DNA sequence: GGCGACCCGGCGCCGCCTACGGTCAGTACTACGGGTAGGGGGTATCGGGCAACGCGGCACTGAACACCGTTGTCATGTGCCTTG
């Protein structure tokens, strides 16, 4: 029962291709640099800090895009490795 | 619109003790890295075997006194003989 609901929760999400995934990774590194700059104790402009924060949030969104995409692969591997004592 | 069915869920039960019962289940890997409980030797502290040194009864060096016992001792008193 619950696994059916989790597979439903996976539902339909956009699968990832080479161009989409590499663009997402580019946004990820952009956001990582943005939060790096934010974490620096040096004073930064307020609007600049908000720009860095929003790109970091967009990178987080990209992260969840990758994870929600590859839930299907990880459950495939789980099927490969299940039935040996753990749930 | 509340009844009504019906439909389903949902549970809940189905009686009391007694002898023994036979077994087995599939698809990573290396690699490092720390860090240890175990292997060692050497040292400080506590835990055993022979004498220790008390006591006590009495016992003796008997010594030195004490307790009767004794024959020492004797200046001093009766009895006979000689003279007033």
């Amino acid at each position: 029962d619950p696994v059916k609901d989790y597979l439903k929760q996976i539902g339909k999400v956009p699968l990832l291709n080479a161009e989409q995934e590499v663009e997402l990774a580019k946004r990820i590194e952009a956001g990582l640099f943005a939060e790096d700059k934010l974490a620096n104790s040096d004073k930064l402009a307020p609007k600049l800090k908000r720009e860095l924060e929003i790109i970091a949030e967009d990178g987080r969104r990209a992260k969840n895009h990758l994870l929600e995409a590859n839930l299907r692969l990880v459950v495939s591997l789980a099927k490969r490795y299940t039935g040996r004592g753990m749930l």
Side-chain angles (χ1 to χ4, degrees):
Chain A
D1 161 75
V3 183
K4 290 79 193 164
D5 214 315
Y6 184 69
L7 258 71
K8 171 209 186 182
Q9 183 44 290
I10 276 164
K12 317 301 177 197
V13 277
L15 265 286
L16 78 172
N17 60 50
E19 48 290 49
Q20 142 177 13
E21 79 192 273
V22 68
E23 175 267 316
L24 288 167
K26 283 189 225 77
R27 300 212 283 90
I28 288 301
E29 51 80 12
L32 164 142
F33 300 147
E35 57 81 20
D36 185 28
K37 290 184 284 291
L38 277 157
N40 303 347
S41 34
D42 63 340
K43 183 258 164 201
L44 273 307
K47 61 191 80 66
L48 178 139
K49 276 216 166 202
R50 297 298 87 70
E51 293 145 32
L52 297 187
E53 171 46 42
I54 181 54
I55 182 54
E57 189 272 329
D58 194 10
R60 288 181 273 283
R61 292 209 75 259
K63 286 260 171 193
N64 330 100
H65 300 351
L66 319 187
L67 329 170
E68 72 190 10
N70 312 129
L71 310 180
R72 314 161 71 90
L73 161 59
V74 299
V75 297
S76 81
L77 295 157
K79 181 220 199 301
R80 185 61 55 155
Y81 266 145
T82 189
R84 336 178 67 83
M86 218 175 170
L87 213 57

